[PDB]
Design a protein around this ligand. Structure first.
Ligand SMILES: Nc1nc2c(ncn2[C@H]2C[C@H](O)[C@@H](COP(=O)(O)OP(=O)(O)OP(=O)(O)O)O2)c(=O)[nH]1
Ligand SMILES: [Ca+2]
Ligand SMILES: [Ca+2]
Ligand SMILES: [Ca+2]
Length: 342
DNA sequence: GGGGGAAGGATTCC
DNA sequence: CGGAATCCTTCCCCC
């Protein structure tokens, strides 16, 4: 089996450069302004000229400006990037019917019934890269291997504007030499848990009693890692379907006053329904971020679709249920809709 | 005992 | 900052 993974380079920043070439060459930082105060919010992403100095996704906008006060700061226009993304995804579909659109800037293609060796795979990769650059002026990185995981690791190793195949012999070296933290799905929590168990590489997961691994990181995660370690991980590329749509917003100032929170909540409901389109959810959750940055939620699933009117009244109750069962103030409020009636 | 859900939260990654 | 998926634990009803 042959998997080709595509990951767009510094996506949001690069789309902005495509729409405004005068930006190419200088540091470009795409941000998500939270509105709490001047420059409050975070960096969604930045082009490589900016990353050289530490400005990257996730850092506070205020820290970014300290490092690169004269860079170009742009507000995130996610809708524009989404449409550019869709077009690129359609281009990729022209290379395989078996495509898994993982996120707004990445996808997996099962090109097994399209090519036979890694040679023809690599070449197909270059053609895909050329096609995208030519058509959307977007550079991307391609990773090729036997499964989704290593295809993705391959690209990570080739970033940016690269292409990289990880063949069977290297898959074995990685299992032995790859920091397990560098394995997709293994975050800081899980990685520290694995270190304590003496597991630093995929290979190590094979020298521990399963039940011990299971008990420490969970069944799903334990089996996942063991599969990879045994060089047996093999999940098929399949069409992913959105399972929830939501919106959470940061308020002007903290509060526990219902009348002061409701408009933010409703606005979130309004935006969520617009985005819902023709989808009808049977479930609703109201989400609150306390002053101490904790995230608390209360939801409800009914036996039928939720109308906007129902969403409004129910959401009010759930918020009321949150405030009554938590002494903290609310910093951010939102709603999420799921269990669609399709 | 154990199947089948639902609710709330933990993690992870874009 | 903030959108969203998967998986985990506890709680429940029920035969
Ligand atoms: N709001 C927000 N958006 C993010 C964050 N991280 C990534 N994104 C968005 C914007 C990124 O362009 C897009 C793709 O993420 P990657 O993880 O693929 O980063 P990006 O493509 O920007 O750089 P790259 O060349 O892949 O290293 O997802 C984040 O922490 N917050
Ligand atoms: Ca990505
Ligand atoms: Ca990317
Ligand atoms: Ca990691």
């Amino acid at each position: 089996m042959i998997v080709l993974f595509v990951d767009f380079d510094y996506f949001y920043a690069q789309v902005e450069e495509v729409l405004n070439p005068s930006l190419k060459g200088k540091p470009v930082v795409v941000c998500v302004f939270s509105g709490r105060f001047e420059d409050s919010g975070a960096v969604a992403t930045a082009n490589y000229e900016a990353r050289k100095f530490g400005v990257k996704a996730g850092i506070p906008i205020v820290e970014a400006k300290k490092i690169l006060p004269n860079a170009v700061y742009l507000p995130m226009r996610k809708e524009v990037y989404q449409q550019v993304s869709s077009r690129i995804m359609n281009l990729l579909r022209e290379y395989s019917e078996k495509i898994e659109i993982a996120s707004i800037d990445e996808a997996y293609l099962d090109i097994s019934d399209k090519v036979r060796d890694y040679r023809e795979a690599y070449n197909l990769g270059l053609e895909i890269k050329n096609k995208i650059l030519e058509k959307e002026k977007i550079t991307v990185t391609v990773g090729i291997s036997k499964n989704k995981v290593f295809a993705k690791i391959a690209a990570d190793m080739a970033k940016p504007n690269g292409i990289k195949v990880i063949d069977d012999e290297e898959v074995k070296r990685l299992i032995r030499e790859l920091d397990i933290a560098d394995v997709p799905g293994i975050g800081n929590i899980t990685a520290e848990k694995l270190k304590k168990l003496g597991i630093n590489k995929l290979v190590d997961t094979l020298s521990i009693e399963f039940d011990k691994l299971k008990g420490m990181i969970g069944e799903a995660k334990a089996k996942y890692l063991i599969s990879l370690a045994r060089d047996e991980y093999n999940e098929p590329i399949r069409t992913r379907v959105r399972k929830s749509i939501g919106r959470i917003v940061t308020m002007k100032r903290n509060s526990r006053n219902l009348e002061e929170i409701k408009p933010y909540l409703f606005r979130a409901i309004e935006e969520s329904y617009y985005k819902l389109d023709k989808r009808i959810p049977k479930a609703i959750h109201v989400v609150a971020v306390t002053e101490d940055l904790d995230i608390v939620s209360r939801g409800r699933t009914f036996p039928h679709g939720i109308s906007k009117e129902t969403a409004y009244s129910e959401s009010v109750k759930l918020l009321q249920k949150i405030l009554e069962e938590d002494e903290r103030k609310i910093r951010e409020i939102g709603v999420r809709f799921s269990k669609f009636i399709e």
